[PDB]
Amino acid sequence: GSAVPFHGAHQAGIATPVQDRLHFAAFDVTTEDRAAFVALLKEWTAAARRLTAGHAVGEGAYGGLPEAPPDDTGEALGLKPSRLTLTIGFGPSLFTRFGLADLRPEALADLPKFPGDNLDRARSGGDLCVQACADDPQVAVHAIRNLARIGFGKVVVRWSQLGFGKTSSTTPDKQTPRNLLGFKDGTRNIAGTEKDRLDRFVWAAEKDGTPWMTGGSYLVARRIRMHIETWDRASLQEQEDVFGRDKGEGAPVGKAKERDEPFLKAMKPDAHVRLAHPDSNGGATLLRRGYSFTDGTDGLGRLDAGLFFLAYQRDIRTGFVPVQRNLATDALNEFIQHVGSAVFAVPPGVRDADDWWGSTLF
């Protein structure tokens, strides 16, 4: 129920312990006025400080002028902060506006086409994003709703994704959650306590070439549909061979315990863990922070199921891209399809009460 501090050198919602729920929204910008956009970032920052402490935005949800709409939509009244974090990112397309073209980071790379991609353009891209994570879904929806309302006339929602449950871990001392394939997902991640690994693999450094991004990170989002009919008729051995870990304990093949270190040569050559492991990718390491989704039925008699994959890294070119390229032969590809994609530059943190989202850029 507690609040996660909002201010810091880094934005919260990355290294932070992974909360139970996600509401992710991508927005397109509809104003050409730089000053108006800056004003929105400041207003959004002010709102975020209230929301993340469990307070209503503006002058509140009620008790104002009867003839005016309330400043806060009211559906989070009486709720705790619920570990809400709000993380903003800027997409490549943003840099075509406001005279920003020369400030686009080289590390904000467009992704290549990957074999098997079937990307829906409507649910891909975006000028900016807000990742809202919280333990209470109502708290997360309220946050995104109120930001969108404040932004009316300057930004529009392009696409959104709700995640009903986490499939990631930044806290190895707590139970690793399972994805909808039934396997633990998050065992070998980066922990929020691993400051050296965060500095090496997640946070942008000044020397990386883009000073305004120092202390920020880069985010890849992939919406991945799972072929659960196909998966559910596979044998136990086939499922375990796909990953290289057993299903019950999630230990590497041959070993007893989840957190025993993988011995890669015992896995099949196309096993997901073997292909994705840093040692298979010149050391490339990611912070994975995704969530599961189900968006109804597929109209063919089955549940829709997927995983909204989020990865944070210091450079897209040295993080997601090499690892995904190495998954071209993954045995898991038989059971998944990537159907949405976006990348974002996640700026540094809001340092104090006078700072604002995007201040280093603008």
Interface with a second copy includes 150 (CB under 8 A)?
no
- If the CB atoms of residues 20 and 185 are measured against ligand HEM, the closer one turns out to be 185
Please return the burial class of 153, using the count of CB atoms within 10 Å of its CB with bins 0-12, 13-18 and 19+. Answer: exposed
Q: Which member of 10, 21, 23, 188 binds ligand HEM (CB under 6 A)?
A: 188
46 three-state secondary structure: helix
Interface with a second copy includes 232 (CB under 8 A)?
yes
The secondary structure element, H or E, covering residue 51 is: helix 34-52
Q: Which member of 234, 251, 264, 339 binds a second copy (CB under 8 A)?
A: 234
The secondary structure element, H or E, covering residue 324 is: helix 320-326
Interface with a second copy includes 23 (CB under 8 A)?
yes
Any known ligand binding at 187? yes
Interface with ligand HEM includes 37 (CB under 6 A)?
no
Note the helical H segments in 129-263: 137-150, 195-201, 228-232, 236-243
Q: Which member of 13, 92, 126, 186 binds ligand HEM (CB under 6 A)?
A: 186
Q: How far apart are CA 39 and CA 255, in angstroms?
A: 56
- If the CB atoms of residues 201 and 335 are measured against a second copy, the closer one turns out to be 335
Q: How far apart are CA 242 and CA 267, in angstroms?
A: 9
Any known ligand binding at 188? yes
CB of 293 to ligand HEM, least distance (A): 10
The secondary structure element, H or E, covering residue 225 is: strand 217-226
- If the CB atoms of residues 154 and 188 are measured against a second copy, the closer one turns out to be 154
For the window 68-107, what string marks contact with ligand HEM as x by the rule CB under 6 A? ----------------------------------------
Interface with ligand HEM includes 185 (CB under 6 A)?
yes
316 three-state secondary structure: helix
CB of 46 to ligand HEM, least distance (A): 29
Q: Which member of 320, 344, 356, 357 binds ligand HEM (CB under 6 A)?
A: 320
Q: How far apart are CA 90 and CA 29, in angstroms?
A: 11
**Residues comprising the chain, all counted:** 362
Strands 165-166 and 287-288: unpaired
Residue 320 touches which of ligand HEM, a second copy, none (Cβ within 5-8 Å per kind): ligand HEM
Interface with ligand HEM includes 221 (CB under 6 A)?
no
Q: With CB under 6 A as the contact rule, which of the stretches 65-73, 76-84, 157-165, 184-192 interacts with ligand HEM? A: 184-192
Residue 336 touches which of a second copy, ligand HEM, none (Cβ within 5-8 Å per kind): ligand HEM
Q: How far apart are CA 28 and CA 286, in angstroms?
A: 27
DSSP state of 184: B
Q: How far apart are CA 311 and CA 313, in angstroms?
A: 7
Interface with a second copy includes 237 (CB under 8 A)?
yes
Any known ligand binding at 288? yes
The secondary structure element, H or E, covering residue 47 is: helix 34-52
For the window 84-113, what string marks contact with a second copy as x by the rule CB under 8 A? ------------------------------
Residue 63 touches which of ligand HEM, a second copy, none (Cβ within 5-8 Å per kind): a second copy
Nearest CA to 205 out of 339, 304, 107 is that of 107
